[PDB]
Amino acid sequence: MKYVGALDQGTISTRFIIFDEKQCLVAQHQMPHRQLTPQAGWLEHDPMELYRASVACIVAAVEDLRRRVPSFEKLETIGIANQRETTVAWDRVTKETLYNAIVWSDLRSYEVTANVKKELGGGDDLFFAKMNGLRISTYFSAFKMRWMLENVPKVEEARKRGTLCFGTIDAWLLWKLSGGKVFVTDVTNASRTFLMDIRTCKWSPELCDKLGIPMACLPEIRSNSELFTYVLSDEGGLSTALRHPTPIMGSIADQQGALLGNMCFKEGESKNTYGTGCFLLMTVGERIRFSDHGLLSTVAYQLGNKSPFIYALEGSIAGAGATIEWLKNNMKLIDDVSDCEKFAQTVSDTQGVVFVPAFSGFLAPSWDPSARGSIFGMTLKTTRAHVLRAALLAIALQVVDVLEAMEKDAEVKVQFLRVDGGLTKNHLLMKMQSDLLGINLHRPTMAETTALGAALCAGLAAGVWKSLEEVKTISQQANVWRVIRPAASKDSQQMLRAQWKRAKQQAKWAK
């Protein structure tokens, strides 16, 4: 019996999962890391703390399994998945980090991004969309790298010596795991930097020159599924816990991992992860799709450097679980997160109340920075139950807008949606989502779809599994899907869609 380890180095915590060759979860760990916020809107992580947490989770899950399963000796391979966009700077020669990791959601690069938009983009945030598939935005790695060159003298010093390494967290982890001997990134993570040509999947000399980031500072782009490195690190007792030489043969941007782990290999197959926010990705196959509605073009996966590059569309929503936390901690409408659903349940409609969770504006495909958190349609009959129901409905409606845009952009009708993340436990939200979309949702019982993604990449390259088709047969028995079916079928919800449109319009506020 062969085993695949999967590391998931996320925003808030790290998890290590061990799967057998039947894709059964047989061991796992998990530890958080500190969320460092030195100023309003700034977020960074200690990069050595992330590596240490990764090591601790590997060591615990491996040693747990050895204790319970006498025949477990070694992992055949390991795959990795990581928080995207988050950017690390370190020195090739000294091997120290030259600053904390600037996290995807950090806002400190705002002036840098406005400067790019004005000076390079002629005022258009989509000016480079054709080349890299993205939007000029504080989210993407190049803007954090530029920030560091202008705000951290030691980074600028390392650049001038020719010893500066920039990388996403995949590159950082592979650097550390190899003991400083490999400098690579997978193509899914490279697609998130702003600096990769999305058509060729190679570094753009034009985007590197224009953002004043030398190509030589960047990792080598590889596929998701090939030898990255042996684990050479014995930091935390890593090498001795693994016992035998162990190859890292998978690396994937976390949300693309989830797309894989949800078995979304073909054109039209889609997933939405429901957490604090949402990440909705649709696979589009080998023909790239460029959005006409402000969505991202991204790489879904490449399985082997001989295989084709497979593309995705992606959109985001900020006000999902965040809305519920805000309702509890700031508004005190509810004493617990779980009361949202319980109280929303007690009414069958909102009596025309709509909640707009555009706390910092609307994202694509309703792009509008000026929109704010809004409530409409209240009368003296309105109760908190109606408002809480309205807040949940808004999560589903934003998913409807992203998905309808993706369908126009890809030219495909989505027949069902895979759904994961901890907010899929909200049964009322999932039914609302299904009723509004008019299609079934599929919720996996084995929840760790990102980890499974990484494991598939590694296991395919190592020959634990012999093909996608094999992977998908095994998954048919390992991971049962729960199906959520629409209750009223399609459009008895015409009224709510009109109201939702009017609401987004009248939420305009900040300008």
What is the contact surface with a copy of itself in residues (CB under 8 A)? 322, 326, 330-333, 352, 359-360, 372-384, 387, 502, 506-510
Choose between 40 and 287: whose C-beta lies nearer to a copy of itself: 40
What distance, in Å, lies between the first and last C-alpha atoms of the chain? 62
In angstroms, give the least distance from the CB of 498 to a copy of itself.
10
Least separation in angstroms between CB 368 and a copy of itself: 14
What does DSSP assign to residue 486?
Answer: P
In the bound state with a copy of itself, the residue whose beta carbon lies nearer, of 121 and 352, is: 352
Q: Tokens for 503?
A: 């609401």
Give the nearer residue to a copy of itself in terms of CB position, either 260 or 507. Answer: 507
Q: What is the DSSP letter of 442?
A: E
Secondary structure element (H or E) that encloses residue 301, with its range: strand 296-301
Please, what is the minimum distance in Å from the beta carbon of residue 379 to a copy of itself?
5
217-256: buried (b, 16+ CB within 10 Å) or exposed (e) per residue?
A: bbbebbbbbbebbbbbbeebebbebbeeebbbbbbbbbbb
Q: How far is the CB of 399 from a copy of itself (least distance, A)?
A: 20
3-state secondary structure 205-268: HHHHHHCCCCHHHCCEEECCEEEEEECCCCHHHHHHHHCCCCEEEEEEEHHHHHHHHCCCCCCC
Whole-angstrom Cα distance, residue 418 to residue 259? 9
* Residue whose CB is less far from a copy of itself, 150 or 339: 339
In whole angstroms, how close is the CB of 258 to a copy of itself at the nearest point?
24
* CB within 8 Å of 500: residues ≥ 6 apart: 354, 394, 397
Smallest separation, CB 371 to a copy of itself (Å): 10
With respect to a copy of itself, which residue has the nearer C-beta, 367 or 376? 376
CA distances from 452 to 8, 245, 298 (A): 9, 22, 20
**How far is it, in rounded angstroms, from Cα 470 to Cα 476?**
10
- Between CA 418 and CA 474 the distance in angstroms is 18
Shorter beta-carbon distance to a copy of itself: residue 160 or 381: 381
**Burial grade of 73 (CB within 10 A; 0-12, 13-18, 19 or more):** exposed
Which run of H or of E encompasses 5?
strand 3-9
The smaller minimum CB distance to a copy of itself, of residues 251 and 350, is found at 350
Dist CA 430 CA 442 (whole Å): 10
> Of 193, 201, 310, whose CA–CA distance to 260 is shortest?
310
Paired with 91 in beta bridges are: 164
The answer to whether 365 touches 295, Cβ cutoff 8 Å, is yes
Cα dihedral sign, 148-152-155-159:
positive
Residue 162 CB partners (closer than 8 Å, separation 6+): 216
Phi then psi dihedrals of residue 143, to 5 deg: -70, -35
Query: 367 or 509: whose CB is closer to a copy of itself?
Result: 509
Separation of alpha carbons 5 and 63, rounded Å? 13
Using the minimum distance from each CB to a copy of itself, give the nearer residue, 416 or 509: 509
> What minimum distance in Å lies between the beta carbon of 430 and a copy of itself?
24
Instruction: Rank residues 441 and 507 by Cβ distance to a copy of itself and give the closer one.
Output: 507
- Shortest spacing between CB 511 and a copy of itself, in angstroms: 10
Give me the least distance between CB of 323 and a copy of itself, in Å please: 9
Nearer to a copy of itself by C-beta: 23 or 138? 138
Nearer to a copy of itself, 106 or 409 (CB): 106
Closest contact distance (angstroms) between CB of 320 and a copy of itself is: 12
Shortest Cβ 37–a copy of itself spacing (Å): 12
Our CB check for a copy of itself shows the closer of 359 and 416 to be 359
Instruction: State the minimum distance, in angstroms, from the CB of residue 370 to a copy of itself.
Output: 11
CB of 192 to a copy of itself, least distance (A): 24
Cβ neighbourhood burial of 359 (10 Å; 0-12, 13-18, 19+): middle
